[PDB]
Design a protein around this motif. Structure first.
Motif, short mmCIF file in Angstrom:
data_model
loop_
_atom_site.label_atom_id
_atom_site.label_comp_id
_atom_site.label_asym_id
_atom_site.label_seq_id
_atom_site.Cartn_x
_atom_site.Cartn_y
_atom_site.Cartn_z
N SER B 292 -3.98 5.51 1.84
CA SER B 292 -5.04 4.52 1.81
C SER B 292 -4.54 3.24 1.15
O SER B 292 -3.92 3.29 0.08
N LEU B 293 -4.82 2.10 1.77
CA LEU B 293 -4.56 0.82 1.14
C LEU B 293 -5.65 0.55 0.11
O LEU B 293 -6.84 0.67 0.40
N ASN B 294 -5.25 0.17 -1.10
CA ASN B 294 -6.19 0.02 -2.19
C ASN B 294 -6.94 -1.31 -2.07
O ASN B 294 -6.71 -2.12 -1.17
N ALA B 295 -7.87 -1.53 -3.02
CA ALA B 295 -8.68 -2.74 -3.00
C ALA B 295 -7.85 -4.01 -3.18
O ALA B 295 -8.29 -5.09 -2.78
N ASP B 296 -6.66 -3.90 -3.78
CA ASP B 296 -5.78 -5.05 -3.94
C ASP B 296 -5.01 -5.39 -2.67
O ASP B 296 -4.32 -6.41 -2.64
N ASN B 297 -5.11 -4.55 -1.63
CA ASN B 297 -4.39 -4.74 -0.36
C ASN B 297 -2.88 -4.82 -0.57
O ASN B 297 -2.17 -5.48 0.20
N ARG B 298 -2.37 -4.19 -1.62
CA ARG B 298 -0.96 -4.30 -1.96
C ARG B 298 -0.35 -2.94 -2.23
O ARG B 298 0.83 -2.71 -1.96
N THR B 299 -1.17 -2.02 -2.74
CA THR B 299 -0.71 -0.71 -3.16
C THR B 299 -1.41 0.37 -2.35
O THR B 299 -2.51 0.16 -1.82
N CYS B 300 -0.77 1.53 -2.26
CA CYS B 300 -1.24 2.61 -1.42
C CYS B 300 -1.58 3.82 -2.27
O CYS B 300 -1.08 3.98 -3.39
N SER B 301 -2.45 4.66 -1.72
CA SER B 301 -2.89 5.88 -2.38
C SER B 301 -2.75 7.04 -1.40
O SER B 301 -3.21 6.95 -0.26
#
Ligand SMILES: *[C@@H]1O[C@H](CO)[C@@H](O[C@@H]2O[C@H](CO)[C@@H](O[C@@H]3O[C@H](CO[C@H]4O[C@H](CO)[C@@H](O)[C@H](O[C@H]5O[C@H](CO)[C@@H](O)[C@H](O)[C@@H]5O)[C@@H]4O)[C@@H](O)[C@H](O[C@H]4O[C@H](CO)[C@@H](O)[C@H](O)[C@@H]4O)[C@@H]3O)[C@H](O)[C@H]2NC(C)=O)[C@H](O)[C@H]1NC(C)=O
Ligand SMILES: *[C@@H]1O[C@H](CO)[C@@H](O[C@@H]2O[C@H](CO)[C@@H](O)[C@H](O)[C@H]2NC(C)=O)[C@H](O[C@@H]2O[C@@H](C)[C@@H](O)[C@@H](O)[C@@H]2O)[C@H]1NC(C)=O
Ligand SMILES: *[C@@H]1O[C@H](CO[C@@H]2O[C@@H](C)[C@@H](O)[C@@H](O)[C@@H]2O)[C@@H](O[C@@H]2O[C@H](CO)[C@@H](O)[C@H](O)[C@H]2NC(C)=O)[C@H](O)[C@H]1NC(C)=O
Ligand SMILES: *[C@@H]1O[C@H](CO)[C@@H](O)[C@H](O)[C@H]1NC(C)=O
Ligand SMILES: *[C@@H]1O[C@H](CO)[C@@H](O)[C@H](O)[C@H]1NC(C)=O
Ligand SMILES: [Ca+2]
Ligand SMILES: [Ca+2]
Ligand SMILES: [Ca+2]
Lengths: 14, 610
Positions: B292-301
């Motif tokens: 999942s792309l996080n709310a920052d659109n930079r990091t993944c989960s």
């Protein structure tokens, strides 16, 4: 031996 | 920075100098069986190639050093492949899996970009400086498709075309080139598929294609040649080389073919995993498959809630989302005969029985930290993890026992032995302190319950069974589930054994596993080669989840562990002080017990020898 054959879904050995 | 022509033929990748007449050499490659598709990275002079027979993608320097496999699993016919030299990404297309995937140039962070309504994607070209990718589709209705380099806004560019190959971009002139293997033409258009022009119509069998300067290069399978002609007029023809039958691909090794810039080149978009070029806005951040792309659109989960299903030589993972993300193969090595799988949600580690090695193995989903928990007359048949006490309860087909081992391999002991016992399938219920297992005594199959130390053993079901081979349970609903492979049905009951009911018995060929995901019960039909699910609330109908999965072996749902709820279990904190077995009673309190070969000490916590 195999010879490449162009099929409906790609190149296959036949 | 000399211009080189690279072509793939048989098991070799060979080199033709485009500037010096005196130069033909083979790239010193090892272990290649069928070199198909070629590309390169202008940054480090690395060359990339796919192998149809090995079903791999690989890379090396042109001098043959640093040979590396970057993609190994989940490929069937990787006939398309292209290097993203700006974002440092590797794209490929597989006509067997009908997928267009992306990963880093070292294979990391593999993600699937196009998977739906895709039929035989074959020839791939990238334009990272503009954010578009182009590819040819074979199949019933062949077409040339266009999409962003993140897979979005897929559209058909050229609908009236045969099977097209060698899709190539003239970056300087903004033109697309391709061969048509049905019309036996070499065609050209603009980036929009308009202004279509036939460049050469007299070629008997054009297959491969590329472009350099004012010339296009093609291969002809009937003429066994690599030939070159004016890209505009089709004249000025010259034969680069002859007597080269079945050239799979040609490629121009020159910096002019990999130029320009985008946001990924200067900063990788600061993305944690993947920077993908897009037309409007320049770039988006991507993630490995199922992340999942996080709310920052930079990091993944990474996914915390997923479905695992295993075959004889593969363990797959799929998620349940609404973009219908595809199932992927986990890059786990040395799988020979996987017959049962489990997952530990605390340490996020995958467990399985390989009955070719007669072991319980464990690894992470990336295949790392491979560990043998149980090894050699050991014949593990099924397993079930007690996540609170950190034990595996597993059945042994050779000694006909239920054995308990901690996740790190230290042996706890046997909690069930018996002359005529044949304990096969097993699910633990540490929340209530009981385990459930099938007893495949000949002429009398049984489903039994016992406490997690072997005491309080009772037969719940002894009729209407032929081969109960798979068990599942859900502690919140207090329900037990099983599948009978011979009766070809799935049943359920209360954990107490009341309210036995047949859930599904129609159009099931051979159920060999099942699992529960919230209100959904999943099962695998080995003979029918499909995964199916039923809504246990009765609201939604029986749904086919995936078909054409061969050698199905097990299926297992994983829900994200609620750590607050987890530490509320009394046996999760130092096993409740118990040396071997921590048990839960109706009082919610903790008691300690022992494997069959120890006795409980007066310390009411520790086990000792008789
Ligand atoms: C491969 O094949 C192609 C096509 O045959 C060759 O390209 C052609 O080369 C010839 C010879 O040089 C060109 O003829 C000259 O054209 C100019 C201007 O023509 C204008 O109109 C053309 C017709 O529509 C048009 O195609 C041209 O477009 C080109 O140029 C623009 C401008 O930058 C560019 O943007 C395009 O992309 C094209 O590249 C152009 O607008 C004309 O003025 C010339 O006359 C001079 O030369 C003659 C004789 O030499 C002389 O008598 C005059 O006095 C004057 O000095 C000449 O007619 C033709 O235009 C080219 N066509 C294309 C499509 O490019 C190419 O050379 C081949 N490659 C090889 C051989 O390696
Ligand atoms: C990450 O990309 C998101 C794309 O959806 C951005 O969310 C959108 O932000 C809008 C404000 O610019 C907001 O009105 C929209 O509702 C929202 N879109 C949704 C929720 O679908 C997000 O932009 C951030 O927005 C807020 C949260 C602040 O943190 C701003 O500084 C951001 O621009 C992007 N987040 C980033 C770039 O950190
Ligand atoms: C590449 O070929 C062009 C075109 O060749 C002409 O057309 C062909 C169909 C064939 O019949 C050739 O023999 C022709 O010459 C060459 O450009 C031509 O050159 C001639 C020679 O003076 C000239 O009379 C024509 O006007 C030219 N035509 C055009 C459209 O410019 C060109 O020289 C060739 N390139 C090389 C490097 O040899
Ligand atoms: C091959 O190319 C690599 C990359 O430049 C270089 O490090 C190496 O020295 C070259 N030669 C050999 C024999 O590997
Ligand atoms: C139970 O497993 C341990 C190792 O995990 C082994 O040493 C022991 O012999 C087993 N007991 C049996 C097979 O009865
Ligand atoms: Ca090409
Ligand atoms: Ca199980
Ligand atoms: Ca299962």
């Amino acid at each position: 031996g195999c010879i490449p054959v162009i099929t409906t879904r790609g190149v296959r050995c036949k | 920075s000399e211009a080189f022509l690279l072509f793939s033929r048989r098991a070799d990748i060979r080199r033709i100098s485009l500037e010096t007449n005196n130069n033909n050499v083979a790239i010193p490659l090892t272990g290649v069986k069928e070199a198909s598709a070629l590309d390169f990275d202008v940054t480090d002079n690395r060359i990339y190639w796919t192998d149809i027979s090995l079903k791999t993608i690989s890379r090396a320097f042109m001098n043959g050093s640093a040979l590396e496999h970057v993609v190994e699993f989940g490929l069937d016919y990787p006939e398309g492949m292209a290097v993203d030299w700006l974002g440092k990404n590797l794209y490929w297309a597989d006509t067997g899996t009908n997928r267009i995937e992306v990963s880093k140039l070292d294979g990391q962070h593999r993600q699937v970009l196009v998977w739906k309504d895709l039929d035989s994607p074959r020839a791939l070209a990238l334009d990272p400086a503009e954010g578009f990718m182009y590819w040819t589709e074979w199949g019933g209705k062949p077409k040339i498709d266009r999409a962003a380099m993140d897979g979005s806004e897929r559209t058909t560019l050229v609908p009236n075309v045969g099977r097209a190959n060698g899709l190539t971009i003239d970056y300087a002139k903004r033109r697309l080139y391709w061969t048509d293997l049905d019309t036996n033409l070499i065609e050209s258009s603009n980036m929009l598929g308009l202004n279509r022009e036939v460049i050469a119509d007299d070629l008997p069998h054009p297959f491969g294609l590329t472009q350099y300067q004012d010339y296009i290069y093609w291969t002809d399978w009937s003429r066994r040649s690599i030939e070159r002609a004016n890209k505009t007029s089709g004249q000025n023809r010259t034969i680069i080389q002859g007597h080269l039958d079945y050239v799979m691909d040609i490629l121009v090794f020159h910096s002019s073919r990999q130029s320009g810039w985008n946001e990924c080149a200067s900063s990788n978009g600061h993305c944690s995993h993947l920077c993908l070029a897009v037309p409007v806005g320049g770039f988006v951040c991507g993630c490995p498959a199922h992340y999942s792309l996080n709310a920052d659109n930079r990091t993944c989960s990474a996914p915390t809630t997923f479905l695992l299903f295993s075959q004889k030589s593969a363990i797959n993972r799929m998620v349940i989302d609404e973009q219908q993300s595809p199932d992927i193969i986990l890059p786990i090595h040395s799988l020979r005969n996987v017959r049962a799988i489990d997952y530990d949600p605390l340490d996020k580690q995958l467990y399985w029985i390989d009955s070719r090695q007669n072991m319980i193995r464990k690894a992470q989903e990336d295949g790392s930290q491979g560990f043998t928990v149980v090894v050699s007359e050991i014949q593990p048949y099924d397993l079930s993890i007690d996540i609170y006490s950190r034990y595996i309860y597993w059945t042994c087909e050779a000694t006909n026992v239920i054995n308990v081992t901690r996740l790190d391999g230290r042996s706890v002991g046997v909690v069930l032995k018996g002359e005529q016992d044949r304990p096969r399938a097993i699910v633990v219920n540490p929340e209530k302190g009981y385990m459930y297992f099938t007893n495949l005594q000949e002429r009398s199959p049984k489903i039994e319950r016992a406490a997690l130390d072997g005491t309080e053993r009772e037969v719940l079901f002894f009729s209407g069974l032929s081969k109960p081979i798979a068990l599942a349970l859900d502690s919140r609903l207090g329900k037990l589930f099983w599948a009978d492979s011979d009766l070809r049905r799935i049943e359920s009951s209360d954990l107490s054994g009341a309210n036995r009911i047949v859930l599904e018995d129609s159009n099931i060929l051979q159920p060999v596993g099942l699992t529960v995901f919230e209100n959904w019960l999943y099962w695998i039909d080995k003979q029918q080669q499909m995964i199916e699910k039923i809504d246990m609330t009765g609201r939604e109908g029986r749904t086919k989840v995936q078909a054409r999965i061969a050698q199905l072996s097990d299926i297992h749902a994983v829900k994200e562990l609620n750590l607050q709820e987890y530490r509320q279990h009394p046996c999760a904190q130092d096993n409740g002080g118990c040396s071997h077995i921590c048990l839960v009673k109706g009082d919610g309190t903790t008691r300690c017990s022992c494997p069959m070969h120890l006795v409980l000490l007066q310390d009411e916590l520790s086990c000792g020898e008789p």
